[PDB]
Amino acid sequence: VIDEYLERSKTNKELNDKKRLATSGANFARAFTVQFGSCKFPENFTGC
Amino acid sequence: PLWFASSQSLSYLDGSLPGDYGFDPLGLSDPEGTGGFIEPRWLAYGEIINGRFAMLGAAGAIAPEILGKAGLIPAETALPWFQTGVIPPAGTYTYWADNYTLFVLEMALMGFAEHRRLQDWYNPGSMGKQYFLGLEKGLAGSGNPAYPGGPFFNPLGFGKDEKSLKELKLKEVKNGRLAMLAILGYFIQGLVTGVGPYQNLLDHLADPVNNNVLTSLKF
Amino acid sequence: GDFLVHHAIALGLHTTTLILVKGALDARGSKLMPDKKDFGYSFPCDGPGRGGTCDISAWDAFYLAVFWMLNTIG
Amino acid sequence: PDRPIWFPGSTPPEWLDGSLPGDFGFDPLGLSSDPDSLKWNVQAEIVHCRWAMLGAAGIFIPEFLTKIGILNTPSWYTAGEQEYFTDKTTLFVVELILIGWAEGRRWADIIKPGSVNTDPVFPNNKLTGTDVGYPGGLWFDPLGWGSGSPAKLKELRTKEIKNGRLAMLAVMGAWFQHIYTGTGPIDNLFAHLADPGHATIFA
Amino acid sequence: EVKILVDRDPIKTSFEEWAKPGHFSRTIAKGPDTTTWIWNLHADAHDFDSHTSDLEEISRKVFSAHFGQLSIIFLWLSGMYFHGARFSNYEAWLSDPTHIGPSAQVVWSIVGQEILNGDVGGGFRGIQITSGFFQIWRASGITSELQLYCTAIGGLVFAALMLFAGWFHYHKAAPKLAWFQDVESMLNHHLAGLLGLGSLSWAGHQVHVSLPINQFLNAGVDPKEIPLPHEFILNRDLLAQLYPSFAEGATPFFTLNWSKYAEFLTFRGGLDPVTGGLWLTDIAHHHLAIAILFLIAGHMYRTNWGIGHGIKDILEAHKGPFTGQGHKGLYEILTTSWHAQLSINLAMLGSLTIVVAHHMYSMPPYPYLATDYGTQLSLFTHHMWIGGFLIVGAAAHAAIFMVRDYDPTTRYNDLLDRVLRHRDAIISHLNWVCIFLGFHSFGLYIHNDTMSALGRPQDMFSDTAIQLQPVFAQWIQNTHALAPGTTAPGATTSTSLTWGGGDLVAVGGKVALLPIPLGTADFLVHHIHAFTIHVTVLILLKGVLFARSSRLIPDKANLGFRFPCDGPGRGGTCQVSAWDHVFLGLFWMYNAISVVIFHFSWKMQSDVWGSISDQGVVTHITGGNFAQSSITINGWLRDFLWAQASQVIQSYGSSLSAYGLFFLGAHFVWAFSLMFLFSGRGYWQELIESIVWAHNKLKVAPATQPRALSIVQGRAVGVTHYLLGGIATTWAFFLARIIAVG
Amino acid sequence: MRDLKTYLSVAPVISTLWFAALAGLLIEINRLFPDALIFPFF
Numbered sequence A: 001v002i003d004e005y006l007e008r009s010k011t012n013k014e015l016n017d018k019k020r021l022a023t024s025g026a027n028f029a030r031a032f033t034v035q036f037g038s039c040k041f042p043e044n045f046t047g048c
Numbered sequence B: 001p002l003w004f005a006s007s008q009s010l011s012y013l014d015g016s017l018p019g020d021y022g023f024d025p026l027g028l029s030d031p032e033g034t035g036g037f038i039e040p041r042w043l044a045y046g047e048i049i050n051g052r053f054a055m056l057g058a059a060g061a062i063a064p065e066i067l068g069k070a071g072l073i074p075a076e077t078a079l080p081w082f083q084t085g086v087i088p089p090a091g092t093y094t095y096w097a098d099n100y101t102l103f104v105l106e107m108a109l110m111g112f113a114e115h116r117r118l119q120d121w122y123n124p125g126s127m128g129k130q131y132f133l134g135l136e137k138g139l140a141g142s143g144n145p146a147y148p149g150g151p152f153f154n155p156l157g158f159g160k161d162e163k164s165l166k167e168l169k170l171k172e173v174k175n176g177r178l179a180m181l182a183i184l185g186y187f188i189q190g191l192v193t194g195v196g197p198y199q200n201l202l203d204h205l206a207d208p209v210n211n212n213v214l215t216s217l218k219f
Numbered sequence C: 001g002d003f004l005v006h007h008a009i010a011l012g013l014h015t016t017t018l019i020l021v022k023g024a025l026d027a028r029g030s031k032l033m034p035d036k037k038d039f040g041y042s043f044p045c046d047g048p049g050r051g052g053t054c055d056i057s058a059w060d061a062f063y064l065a066v067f068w069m070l071n072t073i074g
Numbered sequence D: 001p002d003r004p005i006w007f008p009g010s011t012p013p014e015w016l017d018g019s020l021p022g023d024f025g026f027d028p029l030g031l032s033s034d035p036d037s038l039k040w041n042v043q044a045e046i047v048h049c050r051w052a053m054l055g056a057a058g059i060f061i062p063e064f065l066t067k068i069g070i071l072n073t074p075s076w077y078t079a080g081e082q083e084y085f086t087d088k089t090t091l092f093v094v095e096l097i098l099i100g101w102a103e104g105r106r107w108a109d110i111i112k113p114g115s116v117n118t119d120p121v122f123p124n125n126k127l128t129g130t131d132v133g134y135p136g137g138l139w140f141d142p143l144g145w146g147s148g149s150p151a152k153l154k155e156l157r158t159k160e161i162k163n164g165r166l167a168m169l170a171v172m173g174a175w176f177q178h179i180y181t182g183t184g185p186i187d188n189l190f191a192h193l194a195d196p197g198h199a200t201i202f203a
Numbered sequence E: 001e002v003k004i005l006v007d008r009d010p011i012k013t014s015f016e017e018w019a020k021p022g023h024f025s026r027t028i029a030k031g032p033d034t035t036t037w038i039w040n041l042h043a044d045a046h047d048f049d050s051h052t053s054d055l056e057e058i059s060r061k062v063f064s065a066h067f068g069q070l071s072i073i074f075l076w077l078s079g080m081y082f083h084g085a086r087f088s089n090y091e092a093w094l095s096d097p098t099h100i101g102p103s104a105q106v107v108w109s110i111v112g113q114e115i116l117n118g119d120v121g122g123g124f125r126g127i128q129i130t131s132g133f134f135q136i137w138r139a140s141g142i143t144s145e146l147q148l149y150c151t152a153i154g155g156l157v158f159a160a161l162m163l164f165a166g167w168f169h170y171h172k173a174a175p176k177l178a179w180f181q182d183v184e185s186m187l188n189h190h191l192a193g194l195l196g197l198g199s200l201s202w203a204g205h206q207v208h209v210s211l212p213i214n215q216f217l218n219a220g221v222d223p224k225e226i227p228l229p230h231e232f233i234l235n236r237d238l239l240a241q242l243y244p245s246f247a248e249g250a251t252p253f254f255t256l257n258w259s260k261y262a263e264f265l266t267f268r269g270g271l272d273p274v275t276g277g278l279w280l281t282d283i284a285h286h287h288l289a290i291a292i293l294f295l296i297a298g299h300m301y302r303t304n305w306g307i308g309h310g311i312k313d314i315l316e317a318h319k320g321p322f323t324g325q326g327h328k329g330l331y332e333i334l335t336t337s338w339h340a341q342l343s344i345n346l347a348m349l350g351s352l353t354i355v356v357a358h359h360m361y362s363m364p365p366y367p368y369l370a371t372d373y374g375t376q377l378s379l380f381t382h383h384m385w386i387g388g389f390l391i392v393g394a395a396a397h398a399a400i401f402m403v404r405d406y407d408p409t410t411r412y413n414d415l416l417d418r419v420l421r422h423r424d425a426i427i428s429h430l431n432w433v434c435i436f437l438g439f440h441s442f443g444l445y446i447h448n449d450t451m452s453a454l455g456r457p458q459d460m461f462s463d464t465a466i467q468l469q470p471v472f473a474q475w476i477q478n479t480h481a482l483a484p485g486t487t488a489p490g491a492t493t494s495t496s497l498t499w500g501g502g503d504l505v506a507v508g509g510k511v512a513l514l515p516i517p518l519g520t521a522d523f524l525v526h527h528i529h530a531f532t533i534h535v536t537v538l539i540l541l542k543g544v545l546f547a548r549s550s551r552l553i554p555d556k557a558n559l560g561f562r563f564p565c566d567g568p569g570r571g572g573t574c575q576v577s578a579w580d581h582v583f584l585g586l587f588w589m590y591n592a593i594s595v596v597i598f599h600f601s602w603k604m605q606s607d608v609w610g611s612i613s614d615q616g617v618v619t620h621i622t623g624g625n626f627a628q629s630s631i632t633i634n635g636w637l638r639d640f641l642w643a644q645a646s647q648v649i650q651s652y653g654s655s656l657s658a659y660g661l662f663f664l665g666a667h668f669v670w671a672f673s674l675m676f677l678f679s680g681r682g683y684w685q686e687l688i689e690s691i692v693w694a695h696n697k698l699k700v701a702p703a704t705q706p707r708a709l710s711i712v713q714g715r716a717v718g719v720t721h722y723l724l725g726g727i728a729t730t731w732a733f734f735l736a737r738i739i740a741v742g
Numbered sequence F: 001m002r003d004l005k006t007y008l009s010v011a012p013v014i015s016t017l018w019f020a021a022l023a024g025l026l027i028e029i030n031r032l033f034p035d036a037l038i039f040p041f042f
């Protein structure tokens, strides 16, 4: 609001959408992890 | 000597307790309708325990600052009580082990002591029966949970006479109440002013009118 | 597409026939009321006793089968 | 009656007397109120103690010998991943049949105390055990240290039970340490002993 | 005096009572003879007043049930927060709230249901939610998922604490009867402590946490660059840069020169242009004022000290022109029975819920809430239904009290007797009012339909032929529009944009709010609403008043509260109990609420919601056809039911397909209900006789002889199925339309 | 233990356990074999 944080956001505009997309993809894949192949019957013990 | 005594309070406060001035506006120690943690004996026991712990804390939160100002302790050690690592946002210090490891060790030792104390409170003399490396002889207790006595807790043999015991109990109760008030003052001063209590005392003694509660709150 | 509709028609016919046949056969009496023939063809009920007896007559059976007839024809 | 208990000053449950070996009156959940439940729990505890003792030994001896230059055995966690002379399924099936025969014999002994004391093939050989869970005989007690005075038997049984409990705790500790940290238990022990303070679970 | 009184270990915790079902009632505990026993075991489970007669046990059971309900609610809240934390696109929606649809549920991939994972937006696939939780989280200042996880953990902990508290207060230390009968202390603690302190703490949170974070977000700062909430508390320089008043500290508050806090405590009103919601400073100011008011009002009743008021003295010392001695024995009645309190609280809660729905739709308090149409529609309909159900239940509990807890000898009240002595006039007048209102309201529509069907559009009651305008409502609207100019100098603008007069507010190319016109159609629909409400009131009042006795049956109180009839005599006495009156009034409540929600939906879609181009023209969803098509029944059937059902029936093969399936399923359930409403028990019993014979032939006869359902059970099943089917149909249709078109 | 076992044998608890086991087995079978319209083993 002091236009310094706005300038910080403009400088770091990139990779922020990347982080958001990565978080959304992880949230979606939390249901398809088994169908993907990872988190199979082994290593479910205290995992995922 | 009665302080803010009421008709309801005087019914059950017979004066057979140290520091009984008959002050209880809200009727918390009222004799009938007792259950759970609200009981006439449990409240007194908790008051005594809290007073003792408050005396210990009041001495300990001030001793390092006194030693540092007097020059009897290394400067890097003398710190205000909130900068010793109790509140990591306020400050931190490096000890011989991790802070959470210290917490775990303290919790284990304190649990070992307090479980035995609670088991005494439930069963009076049960703590002197089972084998405890020979120390179980001295942990039998005197039948009063608040004052166990014995070689471990009363090695100097104080208070043999009943009147002297009553006087010492009254002194202990009053000192515990004073220490509880001092601890609350420590908390409030640390929250508001932001510096050590001894620094506050020194600033007040320097200029009594310049530094006070109004000074921190301006006006 | 005609298989399921024909089976639905058969179901409607069977249910309507069941209702009407039960109403016709249980007219003279049953276990809930063994003297139904004394009251007549149409009467309201037999009171709240014996757990409650509503729609006990055969007129009520015809009444209930009318709805199924309408649904099947529809 | 006057034996030491788990929580001093407390009252042990009524169904726990003290005649059973390794009895300390610890049963806050009331899982063994029924006598049949007591027998089943005792048998399960004995079997668990023996199996976990064997497992703890077989885990912690090769790792310690691998810390020294004597042996070169791989990590216990990755033992099943390696390749052997046969597929793992065949070994599992053979082990299943072999252990199943003995487990059926033990189950028959548990259900009826005295029906499997004789060798089925040759009627001459016999098992001298007289207590459930202690088969005895030349096969399971060749040295004869089993039978004896009741006090010595109770002392030996208590020793075995306590060792088994410690072994169960050891195996679960090793499993959890390996999954969390990611290194051998001997490495964790040495690292902790080097720096007792900082090298702990909080790291 | 006021004291804490408890009993130690009244009951012992054991599993022996779990093994034997129906231990509370001896008749149930005896054992199952027929199947009806099972149906009874669930009916009398929560009727604590029938298990025993002592008030102490009933009060203790009520307290424990309240604790269990609180634990369940906390578990539900924790689950919602955990779903928001783990499986959601909250972080993606935070940056671009206008172009992303909220979603917090992910469906598995077992059968082929993966088509339900629609393209909500922000690189996520899932079911679009309409709970409005994202707006709440944004208004609270949450910008990450770790905070949501911590909130879920805290909710779990609090639920466990509530369950333990319930167990402790039933089985370890149970309060005595005198503890519950102290209403003055309870009122003082609920007013000063529960309400004032909570609102004060929330105002403090809003002042310290919500306002700076929301200001940074509204400025345009990226959510990942905003300082953490505790940085504002730790760093006074940041707050001084944001709000200079904080640089002065708390000195102004004690100095009484409160104007210095005018930067973050304002009285402007209206909607915020950036987010289309109320100002957060106004909300904090309102919370502070409400906290002050509640704290002041919480010290009115005398408890344990000289100062205060006595409720009994206030009631007894009341003198008035129409009342007289009046309220003399009401204190004992209210402090003796639970049912009267339950009825009063139920009615008040229902009215409050309806008011909440109205105030929430009128003035949106959350950011980016007005432009999300599905959330608004769902909130309005849900709150209306909840309020209606509570209002219905109030009358049933009032009838229960009047039936089983009323005796004029020991506890006598003059007002109740006076009301009971002239019930015929009340019922007759209410019946006449209902008949007149219904005749006029529906005859207007029938006349419009007949005139339009005969090629006579100049004889109808419309804005063009015969005008019936709501002059009083228009006058009120004009007064409210002109209010801030002269009458309320403190406010810069009016409270709401609904009042005729002002400007249009739109956010992100979508209309947020604009003044709502009023015409003949609003007149007709308002009169229809009044007619339906009056009929429901008539039914409930007739049920309540004639519970004890009637001209037809002079001893109805002996039979009880839940009895089917008296017999085939007297011409027929079916459905004479008050339970039947409640079961009949449920239908009319359903009808009224359905009409209200239909009116709200069509009017909002036709006259308010829409889109705006760059030039400045506004295109509404249905193009403003409400004022000319809603004056006839054919218009309601064609332009609303037929036209707006295109989306739900064409949703197959898409992400909305589930809704379509529900649109069928509910229908089925509705028809099923008819089977339980048009028939009787005797036919089913006679059929079960033959079925039981067929079973007996093959030696598969059960010991528990099958029996047909009782009359009351059949009526309850029918009404439950009817209500469930209708409500589910409306839910599916509304959600499908508002998600596919908005 | 006797009373808890007796309670666990009541009709709703046994019914919910049986139906949960059946639903799990059916879901796992349909997962291992995704689609099935005719019996092809013969």
Ligand code: CLA
Binding pocket: E439, E440, E442, E443, E444, E446, E447, E450, E459
């Ligand atoms: C229910 C309300 C309702 C109302 C108010 C109207 C009203 C109207 N209709 Mg419609 N209509 C309705 C329903 C209704 N209709 C229905 C259900 C149908 C059948 C589908 C029709 C079919 C219909 C047709 C076919 C026609 C109309 C037409 C008309 C008009 C003719 C009026 C008239 O000639 O007689 C009015 C007669 C009176 C005697 C008035 C009696 C009421 C007085 C004022 C009582 C007031 C009481 C007073 C307060 C008492 C206080 C006492 C105190 C002093 C002590 C009128 C505007 C006609 C038209 O062409 O109009 C344009 C026409 O041809 N209507």
Ligand code: CLA
Binding pocket: D054, D055, D057, D058, D059, D061, D062, D073, D074, D079, D080, D082
């Ligand atoms: C309680 C049950 C138990 C179980 C299930 C196992 C299970 C196993 N042991 Mg362990 N072990 C146990 C107790 C147990 N042990 C105890 C009490 C001891 C102390 C004496 C050991 C000491 C031990 C050694 C010294 C070795 C194993 C090995 C093995 C592994 C495979 C070999 C095999 O099982 O044959 C039965 C195994 C033995 C009792 C010892 C004989 C060694 C076998 C025949 C393997 C030799 C193969 C060689 C090292 C690999 C490459 C071959 C080469 C031609 C390339 C397997 C993980 C072997 C290994 O590490 O393989 C990965 C191995 O070298 N164990």
Ligand code: CLA
Binding pocket: E042, E043, E044, E045, E046, E047, E048, E389, E390, E392, E393, E394, E396, E397, E400, E562, E579, E582, E720
């Ligand atoms: C605020 C809370 C509230 C409370 C505590 C009570 C309390 C009480 N009510 Mg009242 N009541 C309320 C609100 C409340 N009511 C409302 C809102 C209504 C209007 C509908 C009523 C109408 C009412 C009636 C008509 C009756 C009572 C009676 C009773 C008593 C018996 C309770 C019972 O046995 O149910 C135990 C629970 C059940 C029988 C469960 C029934 C199944 C429900 C109906 C299904 C709902 C399904 C679900 C929402 C949909 C998903 C389907 C899915 C499961 C597949 C009890 C003292 C009864 C009595 O005998 O009083 C003396 C009585 O006859 N109440």
Ligand code: CLA
Binding pocket: E431, E434, E435, E436, E437, E438, E439, E442, E443, E446, E535, E538, E539, E584, E587
């Ligand atoms: C849609 C069909 C329907 C209709 C029209 C009605 C109609 C009515 N209900 Mg019923 N009801 C229904 C279904 C219906 N109910 C259902 C499904 C239930 C659930 C069991 C109930 C349960 C029920 C209850 C519990 C109550 C009623 C009551 C009423 C009356 C309300 C008073 C009033 O508005 O009269 C005004 C008239 C009308 C709205 C009817 C239409 C008249 C139009 C305008 C035509 C008039 C034209 C003209 C005169 C005809 C002449 C032509 C001829 C010469 C050839 C009214 C007779 C209430 C009552 O009787 O109290 C007064 C009451 O308490 N009903």
Ligand SMILES: CC(/C=C/C=C(C)/C=C/[C@@]12O[C@]1(C)C[C@@H](O)CC2(C)C)=C\C=C\C=C(C)\C=C\C=C(C)\C=C\[C@@]12O[C@]1(C)C[C@@H](O)CC2(C)C
Binding pocket: B023, B024, B025, B026, B027, B028, B050, B051, B053, B054, B056, B057, B058, B060, B061, B081, B082, B084, B086, B180, B181, B183, B184
């Ligand atoms: C135990 C206690 C404090 C203990 C502090 C300790 C150990 C501190 C330790 C440390 O500092 C060291 C050494 C070193 C640091 O590096 C670390 C920490 C950890 C910081 C305070 C109790 C403090 C207790 C207090 C203040 C209690 C106050 C009670 C009051 C006023 C009650 C009043 C009434 O109850 C009556 C009497 C009667 C009723 O009728 C009416 C009302 C009004 C309810």
Ligand code: SF4
Binding pocket: C044, C045, C046, C047, C048, C052, C053, C054, C055, E564, E565, E566, E567, E568, E572, E573, E574, E575, E711
């Ligand atoms: S409710 Fe049934 S039994 Fe009672 S009078 Fe009516 S029809 Fe007869």
